[PDB]
Swiss-Prot record, chain A:
The gene is PIK3R1. One of its GO terms (cellular component) is phosphatidylinositol 3-kinase complex. The chain holds residues 337 to 586 of 724 of the full protein. Isoform 2 is expressed in skeletal muscle and brain, and at lower levels in kidney and cardiac muscle. Isoform 2 and isoform 4 are present in skeletal muscle (at protein level). This is Phosphatidylinositol 3-kinase regulatory subunit alpha. Changing residue 57 to Q: In a patient with severe insulin resistance; lower insulin-stimulated lipid kinase activity compared with wild-type. It is linked to Agammaglobulinemia 7, autosomal recessive: A primary immunodeficiency characterized by profoundly low or absent serum antibodies and low or absent circulating B-cells due to an early block of B-cell development. Affected individuals develop severe infections in the first years of life. SHORT syndrome: A rare, multisystem disease characterized by short stature, anomalies of the anterior chamber of the eye, characteristic facial features such as triangular facies, lack of facial fat, and hypoplastic nasal alae with overhanging columella, partial lipodystrophy, hernias, hyperextensibility, and delayed dentition. The clinical phenotype can include insulin resistance, nephrocalcinosis, and hearing deficits. Developmental milestones and cognition are normal. The SH3 domain mediates the binding to CBLB, and to HIV-1 Nef. The keyword Phosphoprotein applies. Heterodimer of a regulatory subunit PIK3R1 and a p110 catalytic subunit (PIK3CA, PIK3CB or PIK3CD). Interacts (via SH2 domains) with CCDC88A/GIV (tyrosine-phosphorylated form); the interaction enables recruitment of PIK3R1 to the EGFR receptor, enhancing PI3K activity and cell migration. Interacts (via SH2 domain) with CSF1R (tyrosine phosphorylated). Interacts with PIK3R2; the interaction is dissociated in an insulin-dependent manner. (Microbial infection) Interacts with HIV-1 Nef to activate the Nef associated p21-activated kinase (PAK). This interaction depends on the C-terminus of both proteins and leads to increased production of HIV. The keyword Ubl conjugation applies. GO terms for biological process: B cell differentiation; cellular response to insulin stimulus; cellular response to UV; cytokine-mediated signaling pathway; extrinsic apoptotic signaling pathway via death domain receptors; growth hormone receptor signaling pathway; immune response; insulin receptor signaling pathway. One of its GO terms (molecular function) is phosphatidylinositol 3-kinase activator activity. Coiled coil: none annotated. Residues 1-67 form the SH2 domain.
Swiss-Prot record, chain B:
Residues 15-104 form the PI3K-ABD domain. SMART domains: PI3K_C2, PI3K_p85B, PI3K_rbd, PI3Ka, PI3Kc. GO terms for biological process: actin cytoskeleton organization; adipose tissue development; angiogenesis; anoikis; autosome genomic imprinting; cardiac muscle cell contraction; cardiac muscle contraction; cell migration. This is Phosphatidylinositol 4,5-bisphosphate 3-kinase catalytic subunit alpha isoform. Residues 860-868 are annotated as: Catalytic loop. PANTHER family: PHOSPHATIDYLINOSITOL 4,5-BISPHOSPHATE 3-KINASE CATALYTIC SUBUNIT ALPHA ISOFORM (PTHR10048:SF107), PHOSPHATIDYLINOSITOL KINASE (PTHR10048). Residues 720-986 form the PI3K/PI4K catalytic domain.
């Protein structure tokens, strides 16, 4: 009298037209379209269900492939080797989620540095525009002590840009360091997840009340 | 892009007391000024221009009034700080610097644009630079809904504006249950109206005893009559006065912003109906019409800046074909995984329209297929909601596992079939999905262009192939004692199996079905959608279909019904029949179902945005619900573009929302610091840190005098700091307290208490609580008087939320700790409520206990720890923290403890006079939900889209059927439930 969550488990990556019998509150499920059909059996031209099923096998659709029934302590070893992989994976996905956000952060902080530098470069164009007339006045008057204050300031302004530019350029490198680290976390995830698929179908086991 | 933390600078949570800000002057110079973090831009600009005259080129600098500050934010955008009242700490700068400039262009446009951006949490100028026709059309077109709604608000402008802002908080039905009539004194309620009559709060009562079914105007009229009694006028001179001055006044709930602005009966207002049930005295305040109407911002919504041969699909004589060329990126071991292939399939929502078809295997290193794939479907036989799903897959053959997935719409928003070359940036596979394809997930390319990109190509035909208009389709398209069979499926739940026999049976009688409207959902899951012929017939049926309950229309908006004619019918059933009340209570589901829609512009959003901009109470939660899911990258663009369209038109509530958003940011940041850098420190040290920061002027201003996100009727005034604290949990939640600035807080809410939690997903609680409300509503309106307490809970973003504090309530654990025994729980409830209240408070205990045993069971939230059940002093029992349970993973929580209280007598009670009732309550309660199974199934079904670990497939929801025992006869299900009731009889810290 299997569940509706157990029909779908057994039709997964099966060829269309696989078939099996179930108890109702019997029900002949099937795989066609990539779906799960129901054709219920009322328990009738034929003098049996046994006689009936055998004809079709040979949009009424053929019963190509059957499900069979058949396929203690040496399963209690494998569940131990399902508790290791599942911890190791979640730990990777933890590290994957962090790194994913932290990269996205670095990528904003670059855009920001770009717009910051753009502002400061405009300041150099501003200062060279206005300073021009006052630099000439001071040349005429021969006042070096005052041309020094204009140049000193420009020395801090142009100096400050360089400091920001390496700050940007240092982060751009650290981004490529983090990105690579990110590709290798995802390489190590995708090469564990399949293992954890076909060491789950293993979980299906004989039914006894006692635990472990 | 949004900023990733709530820090004051990039990298730094809190600026230290004094910051060196590098100032860029407009003459060219650089000056490095020491500023206080809390300092305003006015004081910074004043101290800057003072110190700027000690530097060269000072003669060039104009009056500081002529200039404004410009800097880069953490959202990597150039913000112009026009509002110079703002503090330094509140600017959200990237690096500590400011640029002095002269402002430019249109002033109000630029300020409004920032305001729209802050609330949303994304800059507006980012939408302006998006190179997408559907996106840019949505932006231009959606403003039509906004134009409607603004034109609707301002018809009969004085009253209709006030209605927008203070909508009546009223039930759906005037008719009130018979068990509520009997609360009333011979058809009548005793009410108190209050009046303020002088500069000082000189208060005057008016205790009236009036018909429950009176309108607010009539309740006012009785007030006027009582004042006029002392005066000596004719009976027909009373009348004259009363009549004219009925409509110069408005009633308002004492203690909160709830107005009686509409001609509804007094009983239909939730606040009164609550007073009737609880058996409390209503206190309303009388208040002048013009004295409200003047407070109303005289608002006006002006428009923003932003405003080939074809053949029909059925003329093309071929099978659908797609070419998979090659992929750019594969992230793989190249040792453990040998080869990779692109699995494909055409889907209609979740069901596939034809066999899946794969590529050949290739080595990971060179991912290039360059192969036409053949789908087992005719091009005309494609439905409208048809789309390609695909994914790149790995192999060990033995082990298949998906690497990156992506879905593409096979028709444009302009109903054009896709053609030519197309690249698709794929998505990472969700957490616990091992399906080769993910037909569920969003449709389209990844905004993150640093991901596996799959190139592909679709066939080019003579012309641009379009999907035909409806009229052409309408043309093409055009048994007894099995009605027992039809009605008998139309009652069964939406998740029940419908055999191919029962499908063929329904399709055959389709034309009959028009008689039994509620069958449409069952009927649709019988249609072959891969038949141009069957489809077109259904379309004719749906067009001439009778209307249905909203509750039932909502089914047709979930994943299983992606057809636009099916959804358009549903939306139309809501447009007409769904009440604002009802809307508000299913707003969680309606927002979440926006995801399943194929295009940005559609009938559902246009419906929602209208209602959101027509009614501010819906608008408020509409905003939050959407905003909360903004961090989620799959939906951020849509919800962003939506929240943009709302914020544009919503009026002055944008300013109220900004203050909320700002208040939450501070709290996020404050928690973040305690969670990270101050994590180790003792409770004393942290509490010392907290009160210091909470007293600062930047904090006090931002978190005083704003409206609660939980409820916009509740104002939050001055902080009671001495009563604020950090809670015991390892996530460090904040118990906050507010004075209530409402004139007469004494009567209703002296103190607004809210919990602020950072780091825990509160959506589960949010969905659970919603459902407990609806269970109570179903019981209450059917005559079953069971009292639940679905307290307030709101998610405001990624594991950040607020919780209403139910006052004067203690956990069972609390009560136990003091003494202990079975009788002590009773003794507490007796100790608190004695005499003629003891009888009413036990009657409350019974009913609450019963409801949270039936609801607890049906939801499977039974076997709850004692710490998670609370009792109010008046005797109301309720469950808390539904998250804490669904994370960790006896049917009922019924205890010999509570049974002593309900029976209220001898300890050795197997059954009692009182007990038997309590039991009959449960059975009627349980059976009431069983008969409304369909609604709860559909509520849960619509929340599969939403990322929740517990609700990812229909297989998860099927537990509800087992509890309700839907398969079994009704009589049987009583027996089934009665088992569980019996069955749930019988070192506590560990
Ligand atoms: C999906 C659903 C719908 C309705 C009832 C149950 C379920 C879950 N499916 C199950 O199989 C299951 C099992 C248990 N407990 C075990 C039974 O023996 C202990 C509890 C729950 N409850 C919830 O998950 C749930 C309650 S309100 C809420 C809000 C959002 C997300 C999930 C929830 C369910
Ligand atoms: C509904 C609700 N009500 C609350 N009220 C109180 O806690 N108190 C009021 C009187 C003093 C204090 C007490 N009993 O200590 S907390 C809460 C609640 C709802 S979800 C929640 C988690 C934070 C545990 C998730 N918590």
């Amino acid at each position: 009298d299997i569940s509706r969550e157990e029909v779908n488990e057994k039709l997964r990556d099966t060829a269309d037209g696989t078939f099996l019998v179930r108890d109702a509150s019997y029900t002949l499920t099937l795989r066609k379209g990539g779906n799960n059909k129901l054709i219920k059996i009322f328990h009738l031209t034929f003098s049996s269900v046994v006689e009936l099923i055998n004809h079709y096998r040979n949009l009424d659709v053929k019963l190509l492939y059957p499900v069979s029934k058949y396929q203690g302590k040496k399963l209690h070893e494998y569940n131990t080797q399902f508790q290791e992989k599942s911890r190791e994976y979640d730990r990777l996905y933890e590290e994957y989620t962090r790194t994913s956000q932290e990269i996205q952060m670095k990528r904003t902080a670059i855009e920001a540095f770009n717009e910051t530098i753009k502002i400061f470069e405009e300041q150099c164009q501003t200062q060279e525009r206005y300073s021009k007339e006052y630099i000439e006045k001071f040349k005429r008057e021969g006042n070096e002590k005052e041309i020094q204050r204009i140049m000193h300031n420009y020395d801090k302004l142009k100096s400050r840009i360089s400091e920001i530019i390496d700050s940007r350029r240092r982060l751009e490198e650290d981004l490529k360091k983090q990105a690579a680290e990110y590709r290798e976390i995802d390489k190590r995830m995708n090469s564990i997840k399949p293992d954890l698929i076909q060491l789950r179908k293993t979980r299906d086991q004989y039914l006894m009340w006692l635990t472990q | 892009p949004p900023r990733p933390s709530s820090g004051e600078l990039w990298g730094i949570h809190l600026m230290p007391p004094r910051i060196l800000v590098e100032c860029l002057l407009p003459n060219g110079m650089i000056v490095t000024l020491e500023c206080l973090r809390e300092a305003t831009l006015i004081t910074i600009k004043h101290e800057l221009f003072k110190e700027a005259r000690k530097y060269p080129l000072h003669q060039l600098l104009q009056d500081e009034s002529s200039y404004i500050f410009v800097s880069v934010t953490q959202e990597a955008e150039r913000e112009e700080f026009f509002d110079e009242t703002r503090r330094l700490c509140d600017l959200r700068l990237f690096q500590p610097f400011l640029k002095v400039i002269e402002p430019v262009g249109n002033r109000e446009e630029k300020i409004l644009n920032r305001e729209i951006g802050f609330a949303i949490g994304m800059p507006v100028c980012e939408f302006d630079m998006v190179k997408d026709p559907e996106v840019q059309d949505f932006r231009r077109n959606i403003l039509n809904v906004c134009k409607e709604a603004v034109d609707l608000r301002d018809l009969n402008s004085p009253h209709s504006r006030a209605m927008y802002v203070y909508p009546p908080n009223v039930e759906s039905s005037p008719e009130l249950p018979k068990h509520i009539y009997n609360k009333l004194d011979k058809g009548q309620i005793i009410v108190v109206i209050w009046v303020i009559v002088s500069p000082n709060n000189d208060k005057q009562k008016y205790t009236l005893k009036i018909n429950h079914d009176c309108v607010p105007e009539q309740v006012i009229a009785e007030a006027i009559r009582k004042k006029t009694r002392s005066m000596l006028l004719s009976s027909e001179q009373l009348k004259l006065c009363v009549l004219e001055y009925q409509g110069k006044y408005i009633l308002k709930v004492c203690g909160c912003d709830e107005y009686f602005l509409e001609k509804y009966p007094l009983s239909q207002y939730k606040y009164i109906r609550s007073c009737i049930m609880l058996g409390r005295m209503p206190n309303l305040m009388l208040m002048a019409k013009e004295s409200l109407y003047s407070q109303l911002p005289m608002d006006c919504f002006t428009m923003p800046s932003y405003s080939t041969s074809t053949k029909s699909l059925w003329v093309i004589n071929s099978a659908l074909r797609i070419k998979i060329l090659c992929a750019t990126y594969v992230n793989v071991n190249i040792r453990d995984i040998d080869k990779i292939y692109v699995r494909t399939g055409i889907y209609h929502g979740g069901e596939p329209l034809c066999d899946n078809v794969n590529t050949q295997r290739v080595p990971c290193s060179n991912p290039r297929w360059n192969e036409w794939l053949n789908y087992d479907i005719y091009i005309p036989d494609l439905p409208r909601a048809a789309r390609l799903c695909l994914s790149i897959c790995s192999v060990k053959k033995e082990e298949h596992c998906p690497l990156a997935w992506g879905n593409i719409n096979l028709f444009d928003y302009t109903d054009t079939l896709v053609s030519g070359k197309m690249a698709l940036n794929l998505w990472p596979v969700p957490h616990g999905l091992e399906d080769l394809l993910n037909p569920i997930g969003v449709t389209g390319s990844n905004p993150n262009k640093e991901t596996p990109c799959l190139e592909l190509e679709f066939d080019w035909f003579s012309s641009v192939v379009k999907f035909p208009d409806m009229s052409v389709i309408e043309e093409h398209a055009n048994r007894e004692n099995d009605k027992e069979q039809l009605k008998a499926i139309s009652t069964r739940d939406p998740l029940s199996e419908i055999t191919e026999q029962e499908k063929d049976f329904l399709w055959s009688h389709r034309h009959y079905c028009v008689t039994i409207p509620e069958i449409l959902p069952k009927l649709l899951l019988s249609v072959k959608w891969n038949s141009r012929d069957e489809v077109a017939q259904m379309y004719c049926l749906v067009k001439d279909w009778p209307p249905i309950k909203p509750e039932q229309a909502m089914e047709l908006l979930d994943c299983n019904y992606p057809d636009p004619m099916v959804r358009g019918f549903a939306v139309r059933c809501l447009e007409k029949y769904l009440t604002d009340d009802k809307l508000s209570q299913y707003l969680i589901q309606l927002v979440q179902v926006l995801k399943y829609e194929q295009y940005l512009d559609n009938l559902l959003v246009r419906f929602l945005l209208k209602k959101a901009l027509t009614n501010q109470r819906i608008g408020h939660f509409f905003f939050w619900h959407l905003k909360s899911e903004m961090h989620n990258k799959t939906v951020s663009q849509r919800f962003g573009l939506l929240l943009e369209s709302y914020c544009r038109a919503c009026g002055m509530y944008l300013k109220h929302l900004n203050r909320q958003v700002e208040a939450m940011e501070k709290l996020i940041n404050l928690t973040d610091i305690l969670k990270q850098e101050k994590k180790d420190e003792t409770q004393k040290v942290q509490m010392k840190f907290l009160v210091e920061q909470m007293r600062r002027p930047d904090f006090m201003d931002a978190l005083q005098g704003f409206l609660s996100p939980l409820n916009p009727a509740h104002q939050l005034g001055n902080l009671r700091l001495e009563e604020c604290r950090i809670m015991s949990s390892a996530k460090r939640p904040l118990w906050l307290n507010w004075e209530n600035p409402d004139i007469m807080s004494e009567l209703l809410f002296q103190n607004n208490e809210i919990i602020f939690k950072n780091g825990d997903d509160l959506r589960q609680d949010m969905l659970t609580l919603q459902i407990i409300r609806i269970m109570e509503n179903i019981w209450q309106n059917q005559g079953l008087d069971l009292r639940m307490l679905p307290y307030g809970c709101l998610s405001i973003g990624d594991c950040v939320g607020l919780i209403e504090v139910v006052r004067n309530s203690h956990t069972i654990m609390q009560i136990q700790c003091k003494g202990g025994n079975s009788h002590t729980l009773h003794q507490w409830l007796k100790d608190k409520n004695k005499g003629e209240i003891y009888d009413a408070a036990i009657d409350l205990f019974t009913r609450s206990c019963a409801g949270y045993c039936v609801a607890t069971f049906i939801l499977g939230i039974g076997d709850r720890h004692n710490s998670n059940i609370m009792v109010k002093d008046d005797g109301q029992l309720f469950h808390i923290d539904f998250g804490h349970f669904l994370d960790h993973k006896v049917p009922f929580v019924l205890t010999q403890d509570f049974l002593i209280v309900i029976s209220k007598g001898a300890q050795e009670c197997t059954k009692t006079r009182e007990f038997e009732r309590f039991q009959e309550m449960c059975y009627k309660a349980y059976l009431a939900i069983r008969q409304h199974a369909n609604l709860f199934i559909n509520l849960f079904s619509m929340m599969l889209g939403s990322g929740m670990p517990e609700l990812q497939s229909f297989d998860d929801i099927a537990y509800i059927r087992k509890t309700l025992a839907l398969d079994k006869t009704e009589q049987e299900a009583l027996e089934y439930f009665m088992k569980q009731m019996n069955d749930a009889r019988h070192d506590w810290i560990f």
